[PDB]
Amino acid sequence: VRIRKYLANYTQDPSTDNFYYWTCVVTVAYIYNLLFVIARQVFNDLIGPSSQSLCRFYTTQVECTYNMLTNMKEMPTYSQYPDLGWSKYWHFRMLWVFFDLLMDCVYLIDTFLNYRMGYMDQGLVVREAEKVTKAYWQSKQYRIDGISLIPLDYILGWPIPYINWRGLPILRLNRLIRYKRVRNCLERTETRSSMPNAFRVVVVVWYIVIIIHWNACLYFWISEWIGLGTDAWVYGHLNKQSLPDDITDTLLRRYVYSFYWSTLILTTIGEVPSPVRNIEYAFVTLDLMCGVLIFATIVGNVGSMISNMSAARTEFQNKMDGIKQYMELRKVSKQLEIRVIKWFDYLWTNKQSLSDQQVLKVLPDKLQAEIAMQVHFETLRKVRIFQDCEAGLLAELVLKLQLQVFSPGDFICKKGDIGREMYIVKRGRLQVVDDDGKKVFVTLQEGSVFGELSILNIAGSKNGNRRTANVRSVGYTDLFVLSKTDLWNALREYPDARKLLLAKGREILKKD
Amino acid sequence: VRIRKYLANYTQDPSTDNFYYWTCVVTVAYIYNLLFVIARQVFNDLIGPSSQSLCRFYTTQVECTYNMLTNMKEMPTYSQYPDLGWSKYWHFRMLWVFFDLLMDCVYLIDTFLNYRMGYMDQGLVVREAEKVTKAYWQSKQYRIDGISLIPLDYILGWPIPYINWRGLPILRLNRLIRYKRVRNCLERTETRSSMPNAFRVVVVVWYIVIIIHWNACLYFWISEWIGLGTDAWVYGHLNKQSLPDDITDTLLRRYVYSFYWSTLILTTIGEVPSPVRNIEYAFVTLDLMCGVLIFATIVGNVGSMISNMSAARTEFQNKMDGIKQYMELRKVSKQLEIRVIKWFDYLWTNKQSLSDQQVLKVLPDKLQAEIAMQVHFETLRKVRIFQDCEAGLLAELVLKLQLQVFSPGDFICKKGDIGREMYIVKRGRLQVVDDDGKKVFVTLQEGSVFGELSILNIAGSKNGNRRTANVRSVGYTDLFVLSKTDLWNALREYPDARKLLLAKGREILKKD
Amino acid sequence: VRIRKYLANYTQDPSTDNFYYWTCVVTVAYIYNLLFVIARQVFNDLIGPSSQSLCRFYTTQVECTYNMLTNMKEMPTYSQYPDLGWSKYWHFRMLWVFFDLLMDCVYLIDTFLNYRMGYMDQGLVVREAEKVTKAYWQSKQYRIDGISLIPLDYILGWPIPYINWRGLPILRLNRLIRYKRVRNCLERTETRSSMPNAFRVVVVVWYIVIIIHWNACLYFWISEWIGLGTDAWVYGHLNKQSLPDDITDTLLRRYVYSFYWSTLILTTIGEVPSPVRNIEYAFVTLDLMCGVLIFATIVGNVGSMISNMSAARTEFQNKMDGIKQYMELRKVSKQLEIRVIKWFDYLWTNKQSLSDQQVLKVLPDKLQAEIAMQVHFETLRKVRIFQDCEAGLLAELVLKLQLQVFSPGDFICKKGDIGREMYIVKRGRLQVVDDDGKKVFVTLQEGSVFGELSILNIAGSKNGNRRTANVRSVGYTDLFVLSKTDLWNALREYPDARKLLLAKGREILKKD
Amino acid sequence: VRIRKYLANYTQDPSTDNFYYWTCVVTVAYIYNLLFVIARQVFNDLIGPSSQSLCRFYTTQVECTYNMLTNMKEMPTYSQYPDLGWSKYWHFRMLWVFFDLLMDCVYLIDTFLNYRMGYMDQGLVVREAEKVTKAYWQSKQYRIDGISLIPLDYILGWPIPYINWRGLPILRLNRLIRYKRVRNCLERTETRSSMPNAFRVVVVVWYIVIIIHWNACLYFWISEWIGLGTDAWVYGHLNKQSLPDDITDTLLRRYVYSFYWSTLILTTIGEVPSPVRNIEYAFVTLDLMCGVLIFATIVGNVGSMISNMSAARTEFQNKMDGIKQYMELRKVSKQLEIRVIKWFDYLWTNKQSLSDQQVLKVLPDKLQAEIAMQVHFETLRKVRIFQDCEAGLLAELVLKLQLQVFSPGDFICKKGDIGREMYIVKRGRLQVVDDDGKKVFVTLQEGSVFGELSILNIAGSKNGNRRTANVRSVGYTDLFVLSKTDLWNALREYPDARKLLLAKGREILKKD
Structure with a gap:
């Protein structure tokens, strides 16, 4: 039921x-x-x-032992069983x-x-x-x-x-x-698969073995149709590479030698006996040609599948060689050259080289937003403007935050430079140093927001477009970089974040 | 006449x-x-x-039978016919x-x-x-x-x-x-051709056979000029690979062995007898070199022609590997990871991956418009604004509709998000759900238009730039995505469509 | 002096x-x-x-004839000349x-x-x-x-x-x-060179011969240092591939066999005798490895140099395959499919596929302007606005003219479509047909200008932005396509051309 | 302590x-x-x-000399030492x-x-x-x-x-x-490394030798396990390629022959004895397959590492071939063709082809600014507007200066053309010639600034948008090209540079 x-x-x-x-x-x-x-x-x-094998023994025909299938001067003749x-x-x-x-x-x-x-x-x-x-x-x-x-x-x-x-x-x-x-x-x-290239290599290795296996059966089929041990190309006692001295003719030997023959022919090594008859010439010519063309494709792919296992490193290495070659021609000082090389070294040990443009390029923007909001969740949980305001602000901005890496000494903002971006600290630590030297006033950790005072348009103080302070990186810093235009789009759409940013900037400027 | x-x-x-x-x-x-x-x-x-062949028989010269062209200790000497x-x-x-x-x-x-x-x-x-x-x-x-x-x-x-x-x-x-x-x-x-790569492979296989055929005639021409059976490189009784034991010298044998020789030399397998004379050394050296260079090009191409038979799959697989590698490094949750992977899987089983940018890129825009208007004819026949208005609207917009794929749960519009696009349903089914949960109000099938209320600028109601309702995908949805700027270009050029859209949006908003 | x-x-x-x-x-x-x-x-x-060669003859030592340097059971011993x-x-x-x-x-x-x-x-x-x-x-x-x-x-x-x-x-x-x-x-x-790839191939063929020549001298140097005819790897009477039966040891033979040996070793064919001594094993191993690595590079390049001889055709063929594959999936009608294929066929027989973006990309804009003004000289000599006005107009516009190809039936302008471009006839012939059918009013040959009435902003007549007439291509037409923005830049900078265009358009519109 | x-x-x-x-x-x-x-x-x-070797000598067993390990009809039998x-x-x-x-x-x-x-x-x-x-x-x-x-x-x-x-x-x-x-x-x-590709080639050569070394030990391990001198594939007296006549069996011979065997097998030359037993067939088949696949990857890479040693030249040569092919089709005059070719020749002998886009592309803009300000330091030290004004001007502009190369006769500015750019002389020499011919008025060396009069908007004189003079290149000139928009951004942000430029232009125009 x-x-x-x-x-x-x-x-x-x-x-x-x-x-x-x-x-x-x-x-x-x-x-x-x-x-x-x-x-x-x-x-x-x-x-x-x-069928039994019936070797001629010395006189009369008897069924073959294994000692009679060894060093044989003739192939055995089969006599069918009554009941097969x-x-x-x-x-x-x-x-x-x-x-x-x-x-x-x-x-x-x-x-x-x-x-x-x-x-x-x-x-x-x-x-x-x-x-x-x-x-x-x-x-x-x-x-x-x-x-x-x-x-x-x-x-x-x-x-x-x-x-x-x-x-x-x-x-x-x-x-x-x-x-x-x-x-x-x-x-x-x-x-x-979490190991896509390993699986592809395994699949191609399976393809190769199946091809060599079918070609082995082809070779032995043709050998048996022509007749075994009739010439020196066909498997048999006249081949002398298939059946050397002290080697017994068994079912395992027939498949082992045929698989070896197909391996040598399809890889165009060809260290196998040469054809004796016109039909064998036709077969071997067609087979070598298939081997050349066919293993071309296949072996070419395998090398290319084992290329792409390391292609990010290759792109990195091409960029790095191009820059080194540029800098050696133009005779850039060695201090700046080692600074650039150390920047690249750090950018490699942390795998920030180019691994965002893929997700950016191919995925839909809502999926990109969800991935990015998950990856940087602990960082963007600290950001104040994001934590207490409309959430659409967080989404719309999160798709528009570029990540940049600064060196241990770099100045992110200098006191009179120009205000075009704002920064959110992803990693690292910065200092708001006194003009020209020490006397660090405050320290900025992960989650801190700085740089808005310039790209906001407060009417309160004089500078308007200038940086109000110097910000120096302590070690290597990773910063989210939000442009001024993107900030103002997301602010003209969201009033509460605008009010919060303007109020905090107004307080900072009034305290000078 | x-x-x-x-x-x-x-x-x-x-x-x-x-x-x-x-x-x-x-x-x-x-x-x-x-x-x-x-x-x-x-x-x-x-x-x-x-000419007749005149083998020496045992004593005196007689015309050769086939049994006299087998296992011969000497080549036959030709005597011209009187009438050729x-x-x-x-x-x-x-x-x-x-x-x-x-x-x-x-x-x-x-x-x-x-x-x-x-x-x-x-x-x-x-x-x-x-x-x-x-x-x-x-x-x-x-x-x-x-x-x-x-x-x-x-x-x-x-x-x-x-x-x-x-x-x-x-x-x-x-x-x-x-x-x-x-x-x-x-x-x-x-x-x-509807099978361009198959035809290219056939043409190159023809090229290869013609080259090997001309080289076979070259080899036999040189063998005959040097003299047949004079050394062990030239076709003849001393070669012992061309004429083994029990093999008859026939016109078919001369071409079969020459084609085999050229196959082995041009593919640089070289399992053929070695030259004996300086002229044969020069010929074989020049020939192997031609074989190396020439079959390089050719065989290299064939593998590359059999590459491009699967290059869309390879591009897809590169994007997919890049994304998986990104997500495993950043430790994205497994739920989101399988959602992304299932999105890619669906996008592959339906062949929407990148197969529009070609037509977009190379063709003239009028041809692109005609192709697109034909492909999406049954879909765009249902669209109301397109069905009853000026046709120039349909054309101008049809070139500016991007197709995007959404997952079985995705929210296309959330009640307070931002209005930048409008959508036309190509496939799939959506629901206008009540805020936070069930109570589905209406269902959107293929041909439905939704999302205009925000990107229109009706003065009637308060939201103005916000979505008025939630729209949730039921299964996988394919949507045409028309930007706000494109919509407004085509609307400022066409007044009747503008009036229709504004009137319908006004009614929907007044009914709230 | x-x-x-x-x-x-x-x-x-x-x-x-x-x-x-x-x-x-x-x-x-x-x-x-x-x-x-x-x-x-x-x-x-x-x-x-x-030095004389002094072969042992049968008994006593005598100077070698050529018949004594053949089938020799020993190498000759040299006795220096008194005067060298x-x-x-x-x-x-x-x-x-x-x-x-x-x-x-x-x-x-x-x-x-x-x-x-x-x-x-x-x-x-x-x-x-x-x-x-x-x-x-x-x-x-x-x-x-x-x-x-x-x-x-x-x-x-x-x-x-x-x-x-x-x-x-x-x-x-x-x-x-x-x-x-x-x-x-x-x-x-x-x-x-006017044949750059042919010269590159010749140079690489010279590289290959010089490498094989130096390796031949290397092989014979090592053979002579080890001692000639001492083992079966060294050139001599024991090699039996260098000196077969009935082959005379001459200076030509020593170089011919050495060049052949180096050809087989550097191309890793290796059909040469195997080393006998440890020093010969070291030499041959190092040499085969150089041959593998070195001829890899070289032969790989040659195939790539013979690729780029046909790479425009390959790019064309990739675009064409992509489009055919798109159209077969989406089941586009066969009429439109053959129209697209015939468009591509024509675009190929006239070599207009992509051969402008190179000059556009790499050259300086003044060189591009001079080349373009020379190439299209006979065409732009007919253009009226160009012939009698400021020449800066001709230059500034000539860099901004895109060339497009239309089919034998295509409508370039339809009576109510939209005016965004203007056209100058490079090749072909068009007709200003009556609405819906025949009654051709006028015919446009090379050099004719049409399409400005819409993108000009005459206040005279009602349409303003619409095409005033239909223009149908008779056969295949090549047209210069000048955008509206480019036209108006060059017109706001040049007043006389503006006045001429506006006056002629005003007359045409007044005649209706 | x-x-x-x-x-x-x-x-x-x-x-x-x-x-x-x-x-x-x-x-x-x-x-x-x-x-x-x-x-x-x-x-x-x-x-x-x-252990001692104990060869049988003629009768009884004695320890082997080197003359007893040569031409041996049997392998020696080892007897362990008492103290090993x-x-x-x-x-x-x-x-x-x-x-x-x-x-x-x-x-x-x-x-x-x-x-x-x-x-x-x-x-x-x-x-x-x-x-x-x-x-x-x-x-x-x-x-x-x-x-x-x-x-x-x-x-x-x-x-x-x-x-x-x-x-x-x-x-x-x-x-x-x-x-x-x-x-x-x-x-x-x-x-x-300052020679990255040389190091990569050395590392891959080390990889190859280590692989062949491990495979040699594999071969000799299998030979010793099977038993030395037991068949004609295993190292021993029956191999006859490992131990020819007059060759002594030593520890050096065992490693030399094994390294040679592995070289021939892994490079699929295969000129080594063929397997005799099923286990040897399995080993050699697996090994040749590893050799084919594995040396595919490796040797393929080496050729590609030796490609990229010359890839700038290859890109240059592709652009140059494309342009020559374009110009020969369109039948451009030979004077203009040789002018273009000489332009390319000069651009190559000075390595200005494309070697800035790398640094521009991958580096952070502050690093790019520092590199560029160092490379062009002696040139930008002469520029007057840069030398005495705010330094932010120098930085902001220095990232926005494009470098262009002009020919020995080219006119950079013609008296009535259009003013869109300004130029700073990096190399070369120019002349402000009288209209149509000689009478050179002034000469411009490196560091000179010219072209601003048009892109400034002085109200003083009539032309406004036109060039006031002709500027002709004497030889090959390299010029910084600053657009009008970039100039005006940096000027609206910096008032003193604006005042200086406007004052100097006003004086030049008043002097006419």
């Missing part, structure tokens, strides 16, 4: 996390097919030899059948979830069973789902002794049409 | 589609020449052996002559179309016979047309028995001067 | 063309030294054998001495020109003998000039029989310090 | 130069470990053979122990400096012992410091005869965890 209702009214939401784990499960079944269907077609002892080896290797073949049925159950569950898959209508996922089933039926998706599930390998994919049918494991290649779920899994995996 | 008049007053328009198909036809003739002229010069059994083999291979040579004459008829028709080719005078094609023929005569094009048609290969390009002339198929290389039509065909083919 | 005065008061101007030809002459002497000093040190039979072969090869050695003295005369003339070389003081070249000689003496240039001329190879660089001195041609390597003149020659050659 | 107090209250400042030299010292100890720990594990005769060779090689082992203890003392001093390391609190370094020690204890740094110092190689890393313990030098690999100090040393070294 419960199961019937639940499956009757079930509908899948594609944007969950359980669905992501499910697509990760489907990728495992896809990789299973991708490797082992071609493996079992070409190396057909993966299910069980299905089902009595001997039914356990191997039932393991294979179990894993095949398991991956096909994965495919069936994926087909059901496709049949009941919610879709986005207006930003919202439609999760009504009738709508999702109709959208499935009119989406031509049942074609891909059905072609990928035709159980044609259960009939003709296994050795049937009565018909003397040898099996065609390649009939299971129709499972490889569900590549879209696998492609979506990898994209969502790298979109969710 | 009809044919004479038609050809008398015919003139070609180069910008048709039939002319594009014609240039595609000319490319086929060009490729025919490109491959088979050098093929027939170097491998001169393509027209027929023209015309009696035996007249059918092969007449097939070759037919295809030569067919491609030369293609060249003649192309020359006529060049003679009668219209040209652009003032954006218009001139299709007066007198003008086009004069422009042809004064364009030095008859030089290229004539040099490429000198029928010098019909006299001296075939075996003439009486003169004991062996033939010079290389005299047909003057046909290879019409490369400009072929270059224009490929450029127009990739400009018309 | 004449020569003494002339050389007394002579001073060189470095920016002439004769001086450029002179630096080209100096480059020839530099390349002479670069190749042949190391060639003569390592392959010391370039001046004459200087001066009697036999004085003609070879006097040819070498003549070319050495000629290149040293080139160096002396270059030293004199350096001693009397004018320099820039204030944009002007100082050509007073006293000043240039003083600047030379205080410039530390006499050091480079003298070190590069020490005639130490005339004493100890040749075989002196009496001292039994064998010669040290390597003492002429001090000539290779004058590389600055050679580097300046190549930079000025590519700055003056 | 002194030492105890000094070490009691000592605290380290990380930003000194002595600390940088200390991190350079620590890098030497790190490289010591990196090379020689694995070297001593794999090639265990680095401390002393510890401590009596023979105690001097070698005490040298090794001394260097181990020295590097461990370096590690201990580094651990003490970490324990007493100052940190930045607010731009300032905290140098109170209590605070720095607490911050150390709560920073999990003692974990890295302790794991890297576990003296487990002093007990079990050396041959102990009594226990018959052979030694495990690999137990010293825990020292390789202090890679952070080494990474910081290299980054600070390239940030302080």
